[PDB]
């Protein structure tokens, strides 16, 4: 393996220096006004981006493959590449003098740029450190500050992964990495980065605390999850420009905090995504009346993390009732603030640009005006306390940044007038720009008798005066001259050289001064990042609570009550999504307690069994978010998990296996027509057993819909079973469904579909009666 | 109700004269370089087309509402309008001297323009004349010449409508018009147009024959269908520019010609349309390797009309075998011909434009070159005899029309050179155009000393010579002058007036001459329409048979045999659509006779039950189209109908009613999991009865898939019953489906999905055993 380095250009040789460090990722090498890619990176990017592949120069004889993109559209192409789980290192040149650096690595899970994120996109990076009994989970969202760790098991893993919706996963390079789907981008990390002891040094040093007990860890059992946090914190460090200091606390997630739901249950209920994978009526889209982007994202969070702690739930409920009389002024203020949660993020990772501070400034002022707007008597009063706390940050931004700064700091006109006296003075040499030149042209027109001379400028030559070749002979030896032209001839003069060296120096010192003063206020903002993140969280909380208020007031939701005994009482409740799809939707009751635990639904095929079942689960879910539920009243007992089951057939049996040995007395199980598949022999036998389990060996409140009429006999075999069914009425030779729960099991009226039949249908009426 | 007529403009008064005759249709009133619509038409069209609604002028004091479209995109909006089932009258002005006329009425069922039709779109207009016991059906396709009538019943109506895929329906305005869907565009026709006696005069005069016995009618029972044909013939006349003379014969369709399939069966088998209504793998898309558009349309026709006559089937089968050795040269010729079936149609209706004759000419020549290409021994030899028959038409077209004519006849350069001697001479005055003017400019440059004069032309002044106002004083009195300008001044002269009156007269006489000669050869073509229609039918037939030859050679299809006894033998057959979706598809046998009639499929879910069933029905269907079936060998007995049954539940019971009292010994019935709905009591009772009918009270060859294991006992109760099932094998903790038919009823192995369960599954294994 001998080399050139005469076989390869020094521009290319430098590229290979960078590319060697990022052999797994695409490298956007800045080349002029383009980012270019070389070699296999070129062939890859030319496939992926439908941009033209080409060739530049030679390397060891061989033409070098190349492909590029204009700088003005780089974020756009970057957005595509990360949609396809690709990382890109951005190689720019940096210095005073110049070195080729990587500056920033864009990965699917560390996005903070508004250009690479949808407005309601939650963006998480999760790292799994597997012991083998336990598994350390640690996740973070650079855009929201979130930073949590959890201890979990191997089989309970894909549930946690679906819950977190991670955009990127960090795995060890070890041979005992957990087998898993792929998924989002999966990024493997060289083993020792998940070290618990090194992960503990990193964490304690990042938060500047003694140990990790306050967060509820210590390297006893949690060691594996401490290392996973460590690995996350390192990967953030390797990818981000500045190491962000906005990662809020670091909480241990226990299973007791939220109503657990398996992956399939999240999917089936269509919480944030349909069964065909969209935003075509979901629970989130039907409730998403948030005024802010950060509010919308928070609501997505809440709908997936229904609280178990009934105190926090009431804290939230006290707020929403209080906001009932004052949400229309609130939602006007919030509607005009920008995404300050993301702006705080971009500040933290050294990625914020001049107009972000303008938006942050103006919205923090708009948040300070909510101090009136509303008051109350709850958690709200701690929310209100936050907004004026942040005015000191707004004032300093008002004083340091223009009302409208230029887009790029490099262009100047970012720092405000009067913030720095020197800058104003430096900047003042500008009228002396144009007025000294008008005072000079006129003092040369009469001096030469030519109204065909003006003081011109170009980047290469600087200031000059040009005269035609005819008039070039008319010029004094006071003029200095340089380059020769075709029609004309341009001249320097020492009395504008003195001017040129004054204004161009003033330009450079001003540009340099704005840079240093901007970096100065970023130094300040980054230290004031705690108050900023509190501002973001308070603004978004209030936005969701405001939305909860408006929904209840505008669609008749009621504050559900909580009980200490196993119970689910719902006074004519409704399905919150299907309710805005039907013009008329018929409400229905739901009564269950200790003695009435399993409701066995039987019914025709367009009788609303599924809808009614999903309606119950959705009311229970909503109940524990602090939102009000769609009913006239509701009362729910302590609930721990929600299970559902609504292609086949081992996936039917897989999802029910999980249900059977995880559901408890506090769980709520939903089962829709289990048995479809195989037969009516083995199918009925299984559906018989599964019911013979929810009643006995895990006393769960269950809704069990089924076509197996043979299961009607359960209320006459267990105290807890109940038979209910759904209505079908005769109108005019044509059947209809009023969609109403009715006690009992619907009788047999398929032979009633003689409303258009032909027989010899007695032969049917002779097989049933079947006693 | 007094009027203006001073309250309305004469340009609007003339519109109301036209609009009054077409009160039900939209009227495109040509207004300059636009077609505009007024009053309620405007409001209608503004909504439908997303075009801006506005105002022009006043009528009785009120601003007249208006909306319009440009001429250059008129066919595009018309296309939209007939997609939404609307009719449009095109009001142009005609004359020598100008009258407002309607010229053409575009209706959804009389389309012939390539610009209003999809390439493979079949376009039929059907007229129903209801007695009440009988119903006269009559339909026609202007694009294909098809013109048929049929006698039918009131309930058998929606089956026929769906079979004919009518783009438009003609109903009597009577109060006893049949209740029906709507559908396509339904067009009501003023009662007496469906008159049988008046219908018979129309029909006999159209074909110029004594009565209708040769077609198999006479006003005995066929009176109601004769009038239907009359109404159709009239609507064609009211709507078409020229009354077309290409309508082929007039056959009476009887129910015994084709294998009947109800509306649901045509949908379920996905013959030319999916269950979600697309071209996502259908039986037609999977076979459609036709080189021509007209070939494709014909394929659609045969897929919906499987022949009962086994002689015509063998005729087609003899042609496809003989083409096995000669289809690659055939499909290269056919690939380069145009849509001559439609072109013949546009000629018939006086709608043909110059380039259509060009395309027809070239393709009729290309069709003549198939006289070698292939020969054979069958029906083929009559096909070969047709192509050279049509050369006389190609010759005349070659001599009369340019190799490339202008787009519009009004622009000239359509009639070929040397076809008419006078036209060439009239046309020849054109070099005398440019050369006489070069011989005149030069004779005016030196005569005035000005190289700043050139002979010009504009549409207002004719020919002229212009000179600047400085040089207008330099012009002779030999110049005549007219309009004054700004910089210049233009002059007429009697020696270019003589020239102006020579070349413009020659232009008009030539444009007029081309018009009369073009109409002259259209007169010839329209009388040579019978040869043309035969050319189109012979080209298309061969294209479909060639395709059948390529499919059999390239996907291992075999020529099915026919039997005279009830039988369906299929040596490992395959599903022709699913077979190109799976990389590997496992073939399966099918054996049924007089003693083995009902195959009772039981099986797991993803066991290929449905697919195998639909495979049998599709093979039987394909067998009767002449095409070879996807198998190693196949033998089918006499078949009359194919019924299928694969949301709920009265529509389950409606479709099965139909099946139960229409299926015969010769029918082939397919039933997929009948019973799903209601329960397992009344569901099993109904599935019990329905099987207790196919065996006994209509000895039909039936495939009955069900999950009811209770129906396994049938082969031990009836001779004709058979139990088959579909395989499921264990590989590695993971079940798989080899998809193979196996005698017997699959046993009970859903408890076998303990491959991931958790119990207390003995309680299942305790309910089955169920003896
Ligand atoms: N209360 C209601 N008001 C109005 N429409 C309803 C109501 N409940 C159900 N529907 C509609 O009824 C249809 C059938 O509801 P669904 O609950 O799917 O019946 P089902 O037979 O019980 N389905 P499955 O759960 O698979 O058995 C749906 O398309 C709903 O839109
Ligand atoms: N003969 C075959 N050979 C190989 N694979 C097959 C065969 N038949 C079906 N499959 C596969 O089986 C899949 C679906 O089977 P399908 O016939 O729908 O199961 P089913 O439950 O028996 N249908 P249904 O009666 O409508 O419930 C298809 O995607 C095929 O790829």
Resolution (A): 3.3
- Answer for the pair A646, A268: CB distance below 8 angstroms, yes or no: yes
**Token pair in block for residue B128:** 């129903």
A34-38, strands of its sheet edge to edge: A54-59, A62-70, A34-38, A26-31, A88-95, A98-106
Interface membership of B607 toward A (CB under 8 Å): no
**Token pair in block for residue B149:** 């009538």
Rounded distance, CA A319 to CA A316, Å? 5
Radius of gyration (Cα) for chain B, nearest Å?
34
Is B604 known as a binding-site position?
Answer: yes
**DSSP state, A71?**
G
Dihedral sign, CA of B253, B258, B260, B266? negative
Percent helix, strand and coil across chain B, each rounded to 5?
40, 20, 40
Question: Which ligand sits closest to the CA of B672?
Answer: 2
CATH number of B1-116: 3.40.1170.10
> In DSSP terms, which residues pair with A389 in a beta bridge?
none
Burial A143-177 (b: 16+ CB within 10 A, else e): bbbbbbbbbbeeebbbbbbbbbbbbbbbbbeeeee
Terminal C-alpha separation, chain A: 87
Q: Which residue reads 């069990």 in tokens? A: A704
- Answer for the pair B18, B72: CB distance below 8 angstroms, yes or no: no
* Nearest Cα residue to atom 5 of ligand 1: A585
- Give the residue from B656, B685, B717 with the most A CB atoms within 10 Å of its CB, the best one to mutate: B685
CA dist B348 → B242, B388, B521 (Å)? 7, 22, 13
Name every residue whose Cβ is closer than 8 Å to that of residue A245 and which is 6 or more positions away in sequence. A348, A526, A529
CA dist B575 → B263, B608, B622 (Å)? 21, 11, 11
Dihedral sign, CA of B418, B419, B422, B425? negative
Per the rule left: phi > 0, alpha: psi between -120 and 50, beta: everything else, A603 is left
| Helix, strand, or coil (residue A513) | helix
CA distance B160 to chain A (A): 20
User: Which atom of ligand 1 has the smallest separation from the CA of A587?
Assistant: 1
* Nearest Cα residue to atom 28 of ligand 2: B608
For residues B432, B436, B438, B439, the Cα torsion angle rounded to the nearest 10 degrees is 140
Interface membership of A753 toward B (CB under 8 Å): yes
Judging by DSSP bridges, how do beta strands B729-730 and A260-261 pair with one another? unpaired
Centre of ligand 2 from the C-alpha of residue A647, in Å: 13
A609 lines ligand 1 (CB under 6 A): yes
Interface membership of A607 toward B (CB under 8 Å): no
**Token pair in block for residue B673:** 């999991």
Interface membership of A553 toward B (CB under 8 Å): no
Q: Which residue reads 């509607």 in tokens? A: A335
CA distance A763 to chain B (A): 5
- Answer for the pair A20, A27: CB distance below 8 angstroms, yes or no: no
Rounded distance, CA A475 to CA A447, Å? 10
**Token pair in block for residue B609:** 């039950």
Question: Which ligand sits closest to the CA of B673?
Answer: 2
Q: Which residue reads 């060697």 in tokens? A: A20
Using alpha carbons only, what angle is made at residue B118 by residues B116 and B123, rounded to the nearest 5 degrees?
75
Centre of ligand 1 from the C-alpha of residue A640, in Å: 27
Q: Which of A269, A575, A610 to mutate to test the pocket of ligand 1 (most atoms within 8 A of CB)?
A: A610
**Residues carrying CATH 1.10.1420.10, chain A:** 258-375+528-556, 390-525
**Token pair in block for residue A182:** 């792929």
Q: Which of B350, B363, B428 is CA-nearest to residue B397?
A: B363
* Nearest Cα residue to atom 31 of ligand 1: A578
Residue A437, exposed/middle/buried by CB under 10 A (0-12, 13-18, 19+)?
middle
- Answer for the pair A537, A437: CB distance below 8 angstroms, yes or no: no
DSSP string, B596-627: --EEEEE--SSSSHHHHHHHHHHHHHHHTTSS
Q: Which of A587, A572, A585, A577 is CA-nearest to residue A621?
A: A577
Rounded distance, CA A30 to CA A99, Å? 12
Q: Which residue reads 């990662």 in tokens? A: A247
Per the rule left: phi > 0, alpha: psi between -120 and 50, beta: everything else, B98 is beta
**Token pair in block for residue A389:** 């706390």
Scan residues 690-709 of A and list those with Cβ closer than 8 Å to B: 692-693, 697, 707-709
CA distance B300 to chain A (A): 32
Q: Tell me how far apart the 2 most distant CA atoms of chain B are, in Å.
A: 124
- Answer for the pair A229, A149: CB distance below 8 angstroms, yes or no: yes
Dihedral sign, CA of A213, A217, A221, A227? negative
DSSP string, B152-183: EESTTHHHHHHHHT-SEEEE-SSTTPPP----
- Answer for the pair B606, B534: CB distance below 8 angstroms, yes or no: no
Question: Which ligand sits closest to the CA of B706?
Answer: 2
| Helix, strand, or coil (residue B116) | coil
Size of chain B in residues: 771
Judging by DSSP bridges, how do beta strands B462-468 and B455-458 pair with one another? antiparallel
Judging by DSSP bridges, how do beta strands B598-602 and B721-726 pair with one another? parallel
* Nearest Cα residue to atom 31 of ligand 2: B582
Rounded distance, CA A567 to CA B302, Å? 64
CA distance B695 to chain A (A): 13
- If you count residue pairs, one on A and one on B, with CB atoms under 8 Å apart, how many are there? 195
Rounded distance, CA B590 to CA B609, Å? 13
Residue B122, exposed/middle/buried by CB under 10 A (0-12, 13-18, 19+)?
buried
Extended strands (E) in A159-231: 168-171, 185-188
Centre of ligand 1 from the C-alpha of residue A605, in Å: 8
CATH number assigned to the domain with residue range A390-525, chosen from the 4 options 3.40.50.300, 3.60.150.10, 3.40.50.2000, 1.10.1420.10: 1.10.1420.10
> Breaks in chain A, named by the residue before each, with C–N above 2.5 Å?
96, 646
Alpha helices (H) in B242-353, listed in sequence order: 263-268, 283-287, 293-304, 310-322, 327-334, 340-348
- Answer for the pair B235, B267: CB distance below 8 angstroms, yes or no: no
Upper half-sphere CA count for residue B433 (Cβ side, 13 Å): 14
- Answer for the pair A216, A252: CB distance below 8 angstroms, yes or no: yes
Name every residue whose Cβ is closer than 8 Å to that of residue A189 and which is 6 or more positions away in sequence. A127, A170, A171, A172, A173, A231, A234, A235
Interface membership of B733 toward A (CB under 8 Å): no
Q: Which of B739, B741, B742 to mutate to test the pocket of ligand 2 (most atoms within 8 A of CB)?
A: B739
Terminal C-alpha separation, chain B: 87
**Token pair in block for residue A358:** 């303008």
CA distance A746 to chain B (A): 9
Rounded distance, CA B513 to CA B413, Å? 11
Rounded distance, CA B346 to CA B360, Å? 11
Dihedral sign, CA of A255, A258, A260, A263? negative
Prior bond to A769 cis, omega within 30? yes
What are the chain B neighbours of A647 within 8 Å (beta carbons)?
605-606
Centre of ligand 2 from the C-alpha of residue B586, in Å: 10
Is A675 known as a binding-site position?
Answer: no
- Answer for the pair A644, B570: CB distance below 8 angstroms, yes or no: no
**Token pair in block for residue B491:** 């002059």
Rounded distance, CA A297 to CA A301, Å? 6
> Breaks in chain B, named by the residue before each, with C–N above 2.5 Å?
96, 646
**Token pair in block for residue A156:** 């309970």
**Residues carrying CATH 3.40.1170.10, chain B:** 1-116
Judging by DSSP bridges, how do beta strands A721-726 and A598-602 pair with one another? parallel
Is B608 known as a binding-site position?
Answer: yes
- Answer for the pair A427, A414: CB distance below 8 angstroms, yes or no: no
| Helix, strand, or coil (residue B585) | coil
At B491, which helix (H) or strand (E)? strand B488-491
Task: Kindly determine whether residue B750 and residue A693, on different chains, have CB atoms separated by under 8 Å.
Answer: no
| Helix, strand, or coil (residue A89) | strand
Task: Kindly determine whether residue A657 and residue B758, on different chains, have CB atoms separated by under 8 Å.
Answer: yes
Residue B362, exposed/middle/buried by CB under 10 A (0-12, 13-18, 19+)?
middle
CA dist B278 → A366, B161, B271, B751 (Å)? 53, 19, 11, 40
Rounded distance, CA B659 to CA B641, Å? 10
Rounded distance, CA B644 to CA B263, Å? 10
Dihedral sign, CA of B66, B67, B72, B76? negative
**How far does CA B74 lie from the centroid of its chain?**
21
Interface membership of A770 toward B (CB under 8 Å): yes
> In DSSP terms, which residues pair with B644 in a beta bridge?
B670
Alpha helices (H) in B188-241, listed in sequence order: 196-207, 223-239
Name every residue whose Cβ is closer than 8 Å to that of residue B522 and which is 6 or more positions away in sequence. B347, B350, B352
Rounded distance, CA A142 to CA B48, Å? 49
CA dist B519 → A757, B353, B507 (Å)? 61, 11, 18
- Answer for the pair B575, B646: CB distance below 8 angstroms, yes or no: no
**Token pair in block for residue A492:** 């320097």
Judging by DSSP bridges, how do beta strands A641-643 and A668-672 pair with one another? parallel
**Token pair in block for residue B445:** 């440059």
Is A606 known as a binding-site position?
Answer: yes
Task: Kindly determine whether residue B689 and residue A763, on different chains, have CB atoms separated by under 8 Å.
Answer: yes
Q: Which residue reads 């020529």 in tokens? A: B559
- Answer for the pair A568, A599: CB distance below 8 angstroms, yes or no: no
Scan residues 625-684 of B and list those with Cβ closer than 8 Å to A: 647-650, 652-654, 656-658, 660-661, 676-684
Q: Which of B374, B379, B341 is CA-nearest to residue B360?
A: B341
Q: Which of A143, A245, A250, A241 is CA-nearest to residue A524?
A: A245
- Answer for the pair B166, B108: CB distance below 8 angstroms, yes or no: no
Rounded distance, CA A257 to CA A444, Å? 82
Question: Which ligand sits closest to the CA of B589?
Answer: 2
CA distance A285 to chain B (A): 26
Q: Which residue reads 């241990």 in tokens? A: A252
Q: For the domain made up of A258-375+528-556, give the CATH fold.
A: MutS, DNA mismatch repair protein; Chain A, domain 3 (1.10.1420)
| Helix, strand, or coil (residue A415) | strand
- Other residues' Cβ atoms within 10 Å of the Cβ of residue A353: 16
> In DSSP terms, which residues pair with B260 in a beta bridge?
B641
Judging by DSSP bridges, how do beta strands B598-602 and B701-705 pair with one another? parallel
Upper half-sphere CA count for residue B371 (Cβ side, 13 Å): 12
A740 lines ligand 1 (CB under 6 A): no
CA dist A322 → A553, A554, A570 (Å)? 12, 15, 23
Residue B442, exposed/middle/buried by CB under 10 A (0-12, 13-18, 19+)?
exposed
Who among A606, A707, A750 is closest to B686 (CB)?
A: A750
CATH number of B557-771: 3.40.50.300
Rounded distance, CA B367 to CA B359, Å? 12
Judging by DSSP bridges, how do beta strands B147-153 and B168-171 pair with one another? unpaired
- Other residues' Cβ atoms within 10 Å of the Cβ of residue A197: 11
Rounded distance, CA B403 to CA B362, Å? 9
Centre of ligand 2 from the C-alpha of residue B570, in Å: 18
Task: Kindly determine whether residue A758 and residue B604, on different chains, have CB atoms separated by under 8 Å.
Answer: no
- Answer for the pair B625, B300: CB distance below 8 angstroms, yes or no: no
Rounded distance, CA B542 to CA A293, Å? 64
Is B605 known as a binding-site position?
Answer: yes
Question: Which ligand sits closest to the CA of A574?
Answer: 1
Interface membership of A727 toward B (CB under 8 Å): no
**Token pair in block for residue B193:** 């147009």
**How far does CA A692 lie from the centroid of its chain?**
42
**Token pair in block for residue A382:** 């701690």
> In DSSP terms, which residues pair with A641 in a beta bridge?
A260
What are the chain A neighbours of B654 within 8 Å (beta carbons)?
756-757
Radius of gyration (Cα) for chain A, nearest Å?
34
- Answer for the pair A480, A493: CB distance below 8 angstroms, yes or no: yes
Q: Which of B229, B231, B122 is CA-nearest to residue B174?
A: B231
CA distance B493 to chain A (A): 49
Dihedral sign, CA of B277, B278, B280, B284? positive
- Answer for the pair B106, B43: CB distance below 8 angstroms, yes or no: no
> In DSSP terms, which residues pair with A100 in a beta bridge?
A93
Task: Kindly determine whether residue A768 and residue B709, on different chains, have CB atoms separated by under 8 Å.
Answer: no
Upper half-sphere CA count for residue A134 (Cβ side, 13 Å): 14
Q: Which residue reads 């149609």 in tokens? A: B345
- Answer for the pair A644, A620: CB distance below 8 angstroms, yes or no: no
Interface membership of A729 toward B (CB under 8 Å): no
Upper half-sphere CA count for residue B512 (Cβ side, 13 Å): 8
CA dist B746 → A435, B342, B592 (Å)? 99, 55, 20
Supply φ then ψ for residue B519, to 5 degrees.
Answer: -60, -30
- Answer for the pair A693, B757: CB distance below 8 angstroms, yes or no: no
Deposited experimental method: X-ray
DSSP string, A660-671: HTT--TT-EEEE
Extended strands (E) in B74-146: 88-95, 98-106, 125-130, 134-140
Rounded distance, CA A280 to CA A282, Å? 6
**How far does CA B91 lie from the centroid of its chain?**
26
Alpha helices (H) in A430-528, listed in sequence order: 431-448, 469-472, 494-527
Dihedral sign, CA of A115, A118, A120, A123? negative
Alpha helices (H) in A449-577, listed in sequence order: 469-472, 494-527, 529-555
Rounded distance, CA B311 to CA B317, Å? 10
What are the chain B neighbours of A737 within 8 Å (beta carbons)?
none
């Amino acid at each position: 393996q001998s080399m050139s380095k005469s076989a390869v250009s020094p521009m290319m040789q430098q590229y290979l220096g960078i590319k060697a460090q990022h052999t797994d990722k695409l490298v956007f090498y800045r080349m002029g006004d383009f980012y270019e890619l070389f070699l296999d990176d070129a062939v890859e990017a030319a496939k992926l981006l439908d941009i033209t592949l080409t060739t530049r120069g030679q390397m060891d004889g061989v033409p070098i493959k190349m492909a590029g993109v204009p700088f003005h559209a780089a974020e756009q192409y970057l957005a595509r590449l990360v949609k396809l789980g690709k990382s890109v290192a951005i190689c720019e040149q940096v210095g005073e003098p110049v070195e080729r650096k990587v500056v920033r690595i864009v990965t699917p899970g560390t996005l903070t740029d508004s250009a690479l994120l949808e407005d309601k996109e939650t963006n998480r990076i999760v790292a799994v450190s597997p012991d083998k009994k336990y598994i350390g989970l640690a996740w973070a969202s650079l855009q929201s500050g979130e930073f949590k760790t959890k201890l979990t098991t191997a089989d309970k893993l894909n549930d946690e992964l679906a819950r977190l919706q991670a955009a990127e996963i960090l795995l060890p390079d070890s041979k005992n990495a957990p087998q898993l789907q792929t998924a989002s981008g999966v990024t493997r990390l060289n083993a020792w980065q998940f070290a618990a002891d090194a992960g503990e040094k990193l964490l304690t040093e990042y938060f500047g605390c003694q140990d990790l007990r306050g967060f509820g860890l210590d390297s006893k059992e949690h060691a594996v999850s401490i290392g996973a946090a460590g690995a996350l914190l390192n990967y953030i460090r390797l990818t981000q420009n500045l190491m962000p200091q906005h990662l809020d606390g670091l909480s241990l997630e226990t299973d007791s905090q939220y109503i657990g739901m398996d992956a399939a249950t999240r999917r089936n209920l269509e919480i944030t995504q349909t069964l065909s994978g969209k935003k075509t009526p979901t629970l989130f889209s039907i409730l998403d009346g948030c005024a802010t982007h950060m509010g919308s994202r928070l609501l997505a969070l809440w709908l997936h993390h229904p609280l178990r702690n009934r105190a926090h739930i009431r804290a939230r409920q006290e707020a929403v009732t209080a906001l009932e009389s004052q949400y229309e002024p609130l939602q006007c203020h919030l509607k005009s603030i920008a995404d300050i949660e993301r702006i705080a993020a971009r500040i933290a990772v050294g990625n914020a640009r001049p107009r972000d501070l303008a938006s942050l400034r103006d919205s923090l002022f708009e948040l300070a005006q909510i101090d009136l707007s509303a008051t109350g008597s709850s958690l709200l009063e701690t929310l209100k306390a936050v907004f004026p706390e942040t005015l000191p940050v707004a004032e300093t931004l008002k004083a340091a940044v223009m009302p409208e700064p230029s887009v790029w700091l490099k262009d100047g006109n970012v720092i405000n007038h009067g913030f720095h006296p020197e800058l104003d003075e430096l900047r003042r040499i500008q009228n002396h720009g144009d007025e000294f030149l008008l005072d000079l042209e006129a003092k040369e027109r009469e001096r030469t008798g030519l109204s065909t001379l003006k003081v011109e400028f170009n980047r290469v030559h600087g200031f000059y005066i040009e005269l035609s070749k005819t008039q070039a002979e008319q010029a004094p030896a006071d003029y200095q001259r340089r380059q020769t032209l075709k029609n004309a001839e341009r001249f320097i003069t020492p009395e504008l050289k003195a001017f040129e060296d004054k204004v161009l120096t003033a330009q450079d010192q001003a540009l340099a001064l704005e840079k240093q003063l901007f970096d100065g206020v970023l130094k300040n903002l980054r230290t004031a990042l705690p108050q900023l993140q509190k501002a973001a969280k308070a603004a978004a909380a209030l936005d969701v609570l405001s939305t909860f208020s408006a929904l209840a007031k505008e669609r008749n939701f009621v504050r559900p009550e909580f009980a200490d005994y196993p119970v689910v009482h719902i006074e004519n409740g409704r399905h919150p999504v299907v309710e805005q799809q039907v013009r008329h939707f018929t409400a229905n009751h739901t009564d269950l307690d200790h003695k009435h635990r399993l409701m066995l639904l039987t019914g025709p095929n367009m009788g609303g069994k599924s809808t009614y079942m999903r309606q119950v689960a959705l009311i229970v879910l909503l109940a524990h978010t602090g939102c009000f539920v769609p009913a006239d009243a509701a009362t729910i007992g302590p609930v721990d998990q929600i299970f559902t089951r609504i292609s086949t057939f081992m996936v039917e049996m897989s999802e029910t296996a999980y249900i059977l040995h995880h559901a408890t007395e506090q769980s709520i199980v939903l089962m829709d027509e289990v048995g479809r598949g195989t037969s009516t022999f083995d199918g009925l036998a299984l559906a018989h057993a599964i019911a013979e389990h929810l009643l006995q060996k895990n006393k769960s409140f269950s809704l069990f819909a089924t076509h197996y009429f043979e299961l009607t006999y359960l209320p006459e075999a267990h105290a807890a079973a109940v038979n209910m069914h759904l209505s079908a009425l005769e109108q005019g030779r044509d059947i209809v469904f009023l969609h109403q729960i009715q006690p009992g099991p619907a009788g047999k009226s398929y032979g009633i579909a003689v409303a258009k039949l032909a027989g010899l249908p007695v032969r049917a009426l002779k097989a049933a009666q079947k006693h």
